[PDB]
Design a protein around this ligand. Structure first.
Ligand SMILES: *[C@@H]1O[C@H](CO)[C@@H](O[C@@H]2O[C@H](CO)[C@@H](O)[C@H](O)[C@H]2NC(C)=O)[C@H](O)[C@H]1NC(C)=O
Ligand SMILES: *[C@@H]1O[C@H](CO)[C@@H](O[C@@H]2O[C@H](CO)[C@@H](O)[C@H](O)[C@H]2NC(C)=O)[C@H](O)[C@H]1NC(C)=O
Ligand SMILES: *[C@@H]1O[C@H](CO)[C@@H](O[C@@H]2O[C@H](CO)[C@@H](O)[C@H](O)[C@H]2NC(C)=O)[C@H](O)[C@H]1NC(C)=O
Ligand SMILES: *[C@@H]1O[C@H](CO)[C@@H](O[C@@H]2O[C@H](CO)[C@@H](O)[C@H](O)[C@H]2NC(C)=O)[C@H](O)[C@H]1NC(C)=O
Ligand SMILES: *[C@@H]1O[C@H](CO)[C@@H](O[C@@H]2O[C@H](CO)[C@@H](O)[C@H](O)[C@H]2NC(C)=O)[C@H](O)[C@H]1NC(C)=O
Ligand SMILES: *[C@@H]1O[C@H](CO)[C@@H](O[C@@H]2O[C@H](CO)[C@@H](O)[C@H](O)[C@H]2NC(C)=O)[C@H](O)[C@H]1NC(C)=O
Ligand code: NAG
Ligand code: NAG
Ligand code: NAG
Ligand code: NAG
Ligand code: NAG
Ligand code: NAG
Ligand code: NAG
Ligand code: NAG
Ligand code: NAG
Ligand code: NAG
Ligand code: NAG
Ligand code: NAG
Ligand code: NAG
Ligand code: NAG
Ligand code: NAG
Ligand code: NAG
Ligand code: NAG
Ligand code: NAG
Ligand code: NAG
Ligand code: NAG
Ligand code: NAG
Ligand code: NAG
Ligand code: NAG
Ligand code: NAG
Ligand code: NAG
Ligand code: NAG
Ligand code: NAG
Ligand code: NAG
Ligand code: NAG
Ligand code: NAG
Ligand code: NAG
Ligand code: NAG
Ligand code: NAG
Lengths: 432, 121, 121, 121, 432
């Protein structure tokens, strides 16, 4: 009666190592498998499968893979140890608008030349956020000098978030939930098997989620525990909100040789006048979008509840502002103009710019972002929010972020990895 | 018709006609190592299943009819329910606790068969 | 007599007596990875061929006589030309375009055979 | 009863009932490479033995009765001494020098058998 | 007549790569396989197997594995290149006992600060053994300056000799000899198969073997060739001798920043008075133990022979003294008080301490051991000796060591690696 079958369509939850595939990058370059131009997807009829986006180890793998790629891409670049010197700084005062008063420092210093016998007197411009006043009222040091070594990113490697596809190894499969209005947990019908994930762009940001995927029909609210104020709420929009950012300053770049084969890229004089970096969000669009978000929050908090939006709480710049990398430069924008309302042209968000960047939440590994010549203009899609609930007739929501896993969890929520188990036995009516 | 796992929601007797579909899908130094480990594992898992079929006397087959009786205590159901209503995922859950017992019995009946066949030659 | 590939220029029926000759020849961290990849690949290629023979019902054989008829459209030649004049390299070119058709037919006839043999037990 | 190699000191006919016991036990970047090499080798060694059984016509078996006669010059002993007094370790030493001869004969008789079976079909 | 069998219990001697398994370490950290909580051991009835501890390649593998792990654990730590400067030293004379007179040096120097423009005047204490007088009678340099670069061990990685289990890869097996009174060579009955070795602690020492396993019944003498005076004799005790070591000085530690993200850990002022480090060995226990050792040596040298113990011959400190690492500091103790007898409270062994350590027998890779704050106390088991025979009616034995393989050979003597060969043929009476 026992009959053995091999090739049985059975699987179990499993954790494995997925590989990257893709169609001068920081991330996926040549250490990545070329994609299949005609990838497959198979609908599974009558299959109900339980998904849990909050326990999805694909998120942990992506987090680890992008950090490791980031570091490998800085390892061979120029060390800026020679730059951690006493700086003599004054204010940049030439044609400065009020918003930029005190933002730029004109600093001179004694730098190493190619020969070990000689030094050179050089100068460069720094942002106020890059330096620390010491002592002699003009003496400054770079901010990272008492904490860490700093390296210069190689100005040939772009930070463009080129999409990565994750693919399963043989013996494993990735299941995709196609059930619209899937909130991240529990069972869903309409499951399909895919060879690989769609391309996911490793966009790094806080508060606002940029350039991601959109909800198919309705704005969705997803959380690990909606009643736990210690958990974040991810909000996925069903329409994009366009945001236009810029650094309206025609910068120049100069190369300072600091050794036999090494150079420091310094910000030189700025052409034209000095203006503040900023981002524009269409006001009507933002209001309509916020409209939809509240309508959905009411489903969990009550339709007679007062839902208020407020700006961020205190913390470091990387937490309280909207951080993003665009055009090759790192912007920190003030979002208090977006989250200032009860219930529910353009809105201008002022921004600050930094050159010394501490990625993720690490201490000890700083990088210097070389300046970009000319003027930067960026156009991107806001596709979602990270909100934290501040908490008896009202609830206040504030922008959150800083934990990058939340930005990938929002794209990988539809995927699950399973292991195929091809043997099975069953009673039949035959005998060897 | 159906591709890989397309029969997963089908009944056990509707499935089990697609066995070759699933069988064929089983096949910077740090990235190199991670991928070699994934590939080596896929091979090791494949070979363990093949070794197991071999010791049960089912080498080279997708469907292997054995000489072990079915204990009604493992699953007291008729062929009609098992092959026409149930899917393989449901079945796997139903008899998960008896898998090792069944495997032990399959190995033992093959050892006896293999020896009887030697004595007859 | 002949060693590996020594029969390559021989006719198909003179060759095919040397099948075990070829079958047995199929078996600083950067250098380590390059060699592991070469070794892992050799294993994966070997296993794919063995899996394929298995699903066609030819496991464990070097010569396997199947139950699929030969379509004259694949190659309209008599046994005398194929086995006495042609070499295997020439033959492989002649029917390259029909390889996938033939493979599909071999898999299907085995699925039918395997099921008929279950019903007879 | 006995686990892996527990039958090593037993006689040849007491052992050889434990064949599945042994068969199943055959299955910072620098550390990663050392372990991948160990795993790749285990697979390669396993497959060479399986390939060899295949070309001798013993695929899928632990005990395979062949059609090659035993030359008394390889070991002039009766079944009683070989199966009841000797252990497998002792036997392996006794006929070590004839292993390659025997293997060559096994391959050749299979080639002849395989062809005769084709002519009969 | 020929019948082929697969799965035959046959093996041959073989050499393979074993992997480590284990239940902030220098050695086994995360690059190690978790152990099996219920490991197997199978007794092999009627199996006689020849073992040879002197040709056991498991020893060579362990030696290589621990050295490589050691180096990997220092590679990312702070380089102390800036410290190889001229030092201005005087004597530490405050509340010093006679035994410590001239042992500590109070040295000042010009050290690098975080900024490249500035130096700082700092001071630290060094042991006399760490420095060389040059030229100006107060001028010193560190001992390694004309030989090698020196790095500082990261003070977060402990040197605790956490046990490592060696395990065989599939297709191989480890055989264990359980024959009591096995002297390292020749055949033994009572052989069992194990999945892995017992845990072996990678304890590093000279002369005395610490914290190892004990003989089951009698003290055992083992040697490659007992009549060859060029070979060492390993002695395994059947009872431990307890040894208590200490550094009775309440040290303080200070951190000197030497660059952007790097610091040197210096010995600061010492609290309380200054005393010599030492080890205590119970005298009666030592005498009883030595009793047993001689009784066994007589079996090879004659029971009418005079067996004398003597202290070590000259050589470097690492050879002539009992070297060990305990509490995180490296001690060099004088064992002449233990090996001073013909034939056969406490014995106090004075010790010296070093900060600059050259491991194994290498030149070119030195390390600086950061100081440990407070007072160090260690309790350990002497489980054996390494003796060398000095050689017509008497024989003299002296302490030996310096070749670390002798300290692992003493734990791995029971294990052998074999390769499984599952195919075989035999005459049967059947025909296909
Ligand atoms: C930053 O300071 C430097 C001097 O350290 C300024 O450069 C000088 O500008 C004057 C203007 O008359 C020139 O005559 C000097 O020759 C310039 N010096 C050098 C070394 O080129 C520089 O313009 C200041 N930059 C800003 C933005 O204020
Ligand atoms: C973001 O922008 C808002 C206004 O555009 C800043 O808000 C001001 O903060 C100071 C701090 O005490 C208040 O006194 C002002 O009244 C605030 N203005 C308004 C209109 O409320 C806010 O500080 C900016 N945040 C950051 C991080 O720069
Ligand atoms: C912002 O979102 C819109 C809508 O998803 C993107 O526009 C679509 O891009 C796809 C890409 O092939 C086109 O096929 C669609 O027709 C586009 N829609 C429209 C209305 O043009 C848009 O590109 C996104 N913006 C960014 C910067 O990614
Ligand atoms: C080592 O030498 C230093 C000086 O180089 C001693 O430190 C000084 O001790 C005197 C005692 O009156 C203090 O007044 C000084 O301020 C100390 N100098 C510094 C820089 O702190 C130090 O005590 C000596 N240490 C030992 C153990 O003798
Ligand atoms: C180890 O300690 C012993 C004594 O505790 C030291 O022995 C002294 O060495 C000098 C060297 O000439 C002799 O003159 C003394 O007579 C020895 N004393 C005794 C009691 O014999 C020995 O030098 C120390 N060894 C080391 C390496 O420090
Ligand atoms: C010194 O050796 C003794 C004897 O082997 C060790 O004490 C034994 O430790 C085991 C560990 O579980 C206990 O089960 C025994 O009961 C202990 N014996 C006694 C008499 O207590 C002792 O721990 C060793 N010392 C060190 C520092 O390792
Ligand atoms: C401001 O811009 C005008 C434009 O030509 C320039 O002439 C003037 O000198 C600038 N001001 C300063 C302080 O450089
Ligand atoms: C630079 O501008 C800031 C603006 O508040 C002012 O406080 C500071 O004193 C200025 N420094 C100099 C050197 O003028
Ligand atoms: C450069 O070094 C000279 C040396 O005396 C010093 O006077 C000068 O102030 C230094 N320059 C700067 C910008 O610190
Ligand atoms: C998501 O849907 C499941 C379905 O049971 C529900 O239990 C869960 O609470 C929902 N999540 C939220 C945030 O409400
Ligand atoms: C969700 O959060 C509330 C807040 O107290 C907690 O009581 C509840 O147990 C949480 N739900 C789960 C499933 O843990
Ligand atoms: C962004 O730039 C595009 C360019 O055409 C413009 O149409 C759009 O309105 C801009 N968005 C905002 C918010 O200004
Ligand atoms: C946003 O929507 C609310 C709905 O009441 C409306 O009152 C408010 O004026 C809107 N704001 C804008 C900028 O249109
Ligand atoms: C919210 O709207 C739903 C829609 O059916 C309704 O059932 C529910 O009672 C409403 N809650 C309140 C507080 O009015
Ligand atoms: C949020 O708005 C309040 C208004 O007083 C302001 O004080 C606070 O600093 C703002 N938060 C941030 C991060 O700017
Ligand atoms: C928030 O809304 C009030 C409404 O009058 C406005 O005055 C205030 O400036 C707004 N805050 C921000 C940061 O725009
Ligand atoms: C920046 O200045 C350079 C000077 O030649 C000019 O050619 C360039 O067009 C300017 N860029 C912008 C964006 O105005
Ligand atoms: C899914 O269930 C329906 C219910 O009758 C069935 O007809 C259909 O064939 C099932 N899907 C598959 C793949 O068989
Ligand atoms: C069936 O299983 C039961 C235990 O579940 C066992 O006692 C019984 O003997 C088994 N029947 C046969 C025929 O082995
Ligand atoms: C099992 O399949 C048969 C097929 O006709 C159907 O009639 C029967 O109701 C099914 N039983 C269950 C429990 O689904
Ligand atoms: C398998 O074991 C689990 C353990 O709790 C038990 O609940 C389950 O019912 C068992 N399955 C069967 C078919 O008895
Ligand atoms: C090569 O061709 C000649 C032509 O007759 C043939 O005799 C010879 O045997 C061929 N080579 C082999 C290996 O058969
Ligand atoms: C032979 O191949 C042709 C197409 O090349 C096809 O139409 C025909 O049916 C095939 N014959 C058989 C018997 O299948
Ligand atoms: C094929 O082989 C036969 C063998 O005798 C030979 O006579 C014939 O000419 C060959 N034909 C060709 C086309 O080579
Ligand atoms: C195989 O396809 C190629 C494609 O051009 C064709 O030229 C060739 O003749 C085909 N082979 C056969 C045997 O038809
Ligand atoms: C070991 O030898 C004795 C001698 O008779 C035998 O009885 C015993 O069974 C042997 N061991 C094994 C495992 O057979
Ligand atoms: C047996 O072996 C001998 C050489 O050892 C050989 O001459 C003899 O022919 C062999 N017998 C058979 C039957 O092959
Ligand atoms: C071989 O085994 C038989 C079993 O009874 C025993 O009587 C005989 O003495 C054994 N012979 C040798 C040589 O051990
Ligand atoms: C195998 O060869 C060795 C080589 O010296 C020889 O001593 C041994 O006796 C041979 N074995 C047999 C069974 O003849
Ligand atoms: C330090 O003590 C030693 C002890 O012998 C003495 O020789 C030396 O001269 C002393 N040095 C100073 C600076 O007092
Ligand atoms: C430190 O440098 C100064 C520079 O003149 C020198 O005088 C002093 O002696 C140096 N200090 C030491 C301890 O060498
Ligand atoms: C160890 O025992 C063997 C057994 O023959 C003996 O030959 C050897 O000499 C012994 N070792 C020593 C050091 O005596
Ligand atoms: C043991 O050492 C003695 C010392 O001369 C030497 O003669 C003897 O040959 C050595 N033993 C072996 C087995 O080499
Ligand atoms: C070591 O310390 C322990 C602590 O109780 C003590 O009992 C023991 O006697 C000491 N050993 C020596 C040699 O002093
Ligand atoms: C050590 O044992 C010997 C044996 O003669 C004895 O004479 C000697 O006094 C003992 N020493 C101690 C410290 O007990
Ligand atoms: C040493 O003791 C043994 C014990 O039997 C004895 O046979 C041997 O002759 C003794 N040797 C001397 C030198 O007395
Ligand atoms: C051993 O003791 C003698 C006694 O004079 C001493 O000279 C010698 O240096 C000692 N050896 C060591 C290493 O101290
Ligand atoms: C060695 O023993 C003699 C016996 O009197 C003693 O005087 C001497 O100090 C001892 N040596 C050591 C290093 O303790
Ligand atoms: C070392 O000195 C510190 C100073 O506060 C004291 O707290 C500590 O207990 C001392 N340690 C010892 C072992 O006496």
């Amino acid at each position: 009666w026992v009959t053995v079958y091999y090739g049985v369509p059975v699987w179990k939850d499993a954790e494995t190592t997925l590989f990257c595939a893709s169609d001068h990058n920081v991330w996926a370059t040549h250490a990545c498998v070329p994609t299949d131009p005609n990838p497959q997807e198979i609908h599974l009829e009558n299959v109900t499968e339980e998904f849990n986006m909050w326990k999805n180890n694909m998120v942990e793998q992506m987090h680890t893979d992008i950090i490791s790629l980031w570091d490998q891409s800085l390892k061979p670049c120029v060390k800026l140890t020679p730059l951690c010197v006493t700086l003599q700084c004054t204010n940049v005062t030439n044609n400065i608008t009020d918003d930029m008063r005190g933002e730029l420092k004109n600093c001179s210093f004694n730098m190493t030349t190619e020969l070990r016998d000689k030094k050179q007197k050089v100068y460069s411009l720094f942002y106020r956020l890059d330096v620390v006043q010491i002592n002699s009222n003009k003496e400054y040091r770079l901010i990272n000098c008492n904490t860490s070594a700093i390296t210069q990113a190689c100005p040939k490697v772009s930070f463009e978030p080129i999409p990565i596809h994750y693919c399963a190894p043989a013996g494993f499969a990735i299941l995709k939930c196609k059930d619209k209005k899937f909130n991240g947990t529990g069972p869903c019908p309409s499951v399909s098997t895919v060879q690989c994930t769609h391309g996911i762009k490793p966009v790094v940001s806080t508060q606002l989620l940029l350039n991601g995927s959109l909800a198919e029909e309705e704005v969705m609210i997803r959380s690990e525990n909606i009643t736990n104020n210690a958990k974040n709420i991810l909000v996925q929009f069903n329409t994009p909100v366009q945001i236009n950012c810029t650094r309206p300053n025609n910068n120049t770049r100069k190369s300072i040789r600091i050794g036999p084969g090494q150079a420091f890229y310094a910000t030189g004089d700025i052409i034209g006048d000095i203006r503040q970096a900023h981002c524009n969000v269409s006001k009507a669009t933002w209001n309509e979008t916020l409209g939809k978000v509240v309508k959905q929050l009411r489903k969990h908090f009550g339709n007679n509840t007062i839902i208020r939006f407020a700006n961020s709480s205190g913390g470091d710049l990387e937490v309280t502002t909207h951080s993003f990398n665009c055009g090759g430069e790192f912007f920190y924008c003030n979002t208090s103009g977006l989250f200032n309302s009860t219930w529910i042209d353009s809105i201008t968000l002022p921004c600050r710019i930094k050159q010394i960047i501490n990625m993720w939440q690490r201490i000890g590994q700083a990088m210097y972002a070389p300046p970009i010549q000319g003027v930067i203009r960026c156009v991107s899609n806001i596709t979602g929010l990270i909100l934290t609930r501040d908490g008896s007739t009202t609830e206040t929501f504030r922008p959150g972020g800083g934990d990058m896993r939340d930005n990938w969890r929002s794209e990988l929520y539809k995927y699950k990895v399973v292991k195929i188990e091809p043997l099975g036995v069953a009673p039949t009516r035959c005998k060897r | 018709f159906l591709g890989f796992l397309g029969a997963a929601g089908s009944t056990m007797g509707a499935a089990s006609m697609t066995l070759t579909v699933q069988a064929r899908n089983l096949l910077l130094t740090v990235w190199g190592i991670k991928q070699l480990q994934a590939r080596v594992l896929a091979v090791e898992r494949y070979l363990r299943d093949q070794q197991l079929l071999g010791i049960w006397g089912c080498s080279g087959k997708l469907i292997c009819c054995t000489n072990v009786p079915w204990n009604s205590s493992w699953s007291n159901r008729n062929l009609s329910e098992i092959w026409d209503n149930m899917t393989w995922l449901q079945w796997d859950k139903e008899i998960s606790n008896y898998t090792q017992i069944i495997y032990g019995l399959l190995e033992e009946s093959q050892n006896q068969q293999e020896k009887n066949e030697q004595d007859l030659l």
